[PDB]
């Protein structure tokens, strides 16, 4: 239905937590970006202090096409010593484990969602991932895992395929490139049946991923956990398709929690009577990573 109608008893975290407790709320989609990994020591872009601050072009595809050495250097620099998912990754894991997660759609390539125990099935890595890597040569397309790719990115040798010696590229989507087919397929099916859109650590500037929020049904509540409001229709572009409205008198289903996503998710977890379960998972999984 396209009838706009209010399912949250009020436009707050508690309203959403209640909504989540309700029977109406069976299938949750998360949309995430760099905000949920910032605290795992991986910079985002739009953050003032880290991001696009020696070398935007280092992720356009044509620049990578001409000169790929700049990219592989950056990835040595940003390449973390240890991969601990965040509280907000683990919150997503809880949703899986309670059978609430229909899907997590993610712009992040860091692979943390998998490390937290989301499975390929749970995950639309709409911007690809570092998890896997392939030769660029059509006639080869030999596949490589993250250990082989790290050894190269840390050795400071441009990765070259062992069978044919083409450039071996991580399975990320560069700017310019097309998203995976799986993204559109999952998009067609998923957004019919979503009961709640949970939006974390994304500015929603990157298309087509941003437009996902308008593919939700109009009475699907949408919660944004973020440092800044994001997704509001621009005063000027709208002038000339289902954007965030948190504040107007017409606002009926969108809610904004502004802060760190670790606190936000930790708050929400608490309303749901999940805080102990979350605390234990995070503490337990990090310990296990620490013992690896």
């Amino acid at each position: 239905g396209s009838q706009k109608e209010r399912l949250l008893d009020e436009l707050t975290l508690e309203g959403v937590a209640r909504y989540m407790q309700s029977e109406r709320c069976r299938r949750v989609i998360c949309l995430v970006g760099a905000g949920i990994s910032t605290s795992a020591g991986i910079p985002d872009f739009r953050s003032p202090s880290t991001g696009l601050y020696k070398y935007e072009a280092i992720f356009e595809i044509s620049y990578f096409k001409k000169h790929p050495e700049p990219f592989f250097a950056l990835a040595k620099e940003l390449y973390p010593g240890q991969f601990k998912p965040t509280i907000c990754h683990y919150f997503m894991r809880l949703l899986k484990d309670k059978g609430l997660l229909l899907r997590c759609y993610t712009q992040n390539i860091d692979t943390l969602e998998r490390i937290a125990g989301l499975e390929q099935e749970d995950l639309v890595e709409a911007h690809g991932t570092f998890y896997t890597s392939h030769c660029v040569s059509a006639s080869c397309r030999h596949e490589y895992p993250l250990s082989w790719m790290k050894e190269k990115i840390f050795s400071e040798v441009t990765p070259k395929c062992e069978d044919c010696q083409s450039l071996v590229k991580p399975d990320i989507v560069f700017f310019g490139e097309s998203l995976p087919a799986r993204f559109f397929s999952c998009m067609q099916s998923d957004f019919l049946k979503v009961d709640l859109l949970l939006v974390m650590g994304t500015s929603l500037q990157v298309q087509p991923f941003a437009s996902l929020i308008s593919k939700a049904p109009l009475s699907t509540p949408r919660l944004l956990i973020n440092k800044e409001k994001a997704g509001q229709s621009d005063p000027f572009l709208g002038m000339i398709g289902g954007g965030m409205d948190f504040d107007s008198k017409k606002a009926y289903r969108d809610v904004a929690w502004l802060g760190e996503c670790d606190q936000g998710c930790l708050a929400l977890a608490e309303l749901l009577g999940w805080k102990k379960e979350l605390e234990d998972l995070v503490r337990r999984e990090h310990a296990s990573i620490d013992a690896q």
Partner: peptide, 7 residues
């Protein structure tokens, strides 16, 4: 089906 881009 567009390709990744800023906006």
């Amino acid at each position: 089906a567009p390709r990744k881009q800023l906006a």
